[PDB]
Amino acid sequence: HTIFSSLEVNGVNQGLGEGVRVPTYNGPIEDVTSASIACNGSPNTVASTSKVITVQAGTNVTAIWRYMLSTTGDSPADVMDSSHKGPTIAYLKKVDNAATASGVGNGWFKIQQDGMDSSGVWGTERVINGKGRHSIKIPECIAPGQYLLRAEMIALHAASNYPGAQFYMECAQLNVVGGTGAKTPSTVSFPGAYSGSDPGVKISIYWPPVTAYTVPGPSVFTC
Numbered sequence: 001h002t003i004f005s006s007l008e009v010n011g012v013n014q015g016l017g018e019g020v021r022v023p024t025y026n027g028p029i030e031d032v033t034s035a036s037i038a039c040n041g042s043p044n045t046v047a048s049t050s051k052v053i054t055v056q057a058g059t060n061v062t063a064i065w066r067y068m069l070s071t072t073g074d075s076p077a078d079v080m081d082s083s084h085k086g087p088t089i090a091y092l093k094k095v096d097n098a099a100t101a102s103g104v105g106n107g108w109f110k111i112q113q114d115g116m117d118s119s120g121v122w123g124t125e126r127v128i129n130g131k132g133r134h135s136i137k138i139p140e141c142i143a144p145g146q147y148l149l150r151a152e153m154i155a156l157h158a159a160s161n162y163p164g165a166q167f168y169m170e171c172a173q174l175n176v177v178g179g180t181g182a183k184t185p186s187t188v189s190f191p192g193a194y195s196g197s198d199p200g201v202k203i204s205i206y207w208p209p210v211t212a213y214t215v216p217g218p219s220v221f222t223c
Ligand SMILES: *[C@@H]1O[C@H](CO)[C@@H](O)[C@H](O)[C@H]1NC(C)=O
Pocket: 060, 111, 112, 113, 135, 136, 137, 138
């Protein structure tokens, strides 16, 4: 139970729910076939925002995860419960207008993921114990313009069966400047990119102890 509730760019936090479409409820989406898997949604309620955040291509932005919209701190309990082990992931989608595009459908490409490292520590644990910070590189080689940024944490503590995996995501509204457009990513759809039978979605992280993990979705796009 967590919310990506603000974005930091060039060392500056852009504001609570400012350029990030935030729910007030911190509950997960558990149905990978729902339209809500793209940018959150029903049975949650997601606020709109007119702010579109300018970011230079080739630089990193930082999604800031918090337990609730009211959360002031950045200690582990202020981010997400430590039971919620799983990957962090981020995607972009080129859109006409980042303030109005829904995010549902094709066009997403993956730009970051952090599953389990060689010491057995999960991406979500780095966020939980790193002040809620989820660092994501905007590729240098994509076309400039309006994008949605979908940042996600998947909690797998209750994922032995499907439904079970808990998907926490929000979309930020970006204006990417300085992208060269040298490469056009292959894309996937939300809903569509994840299935309940994926080895990273239906997974007992305890029986047996997991030593390696396959993050769901496509390969990370690289320049
Ligand atoms: C920028 O984000 C990328 C992932 O997209 C990562 O490879 C890199 O470590 C990040 N830079 C940081 C955290 O300073």
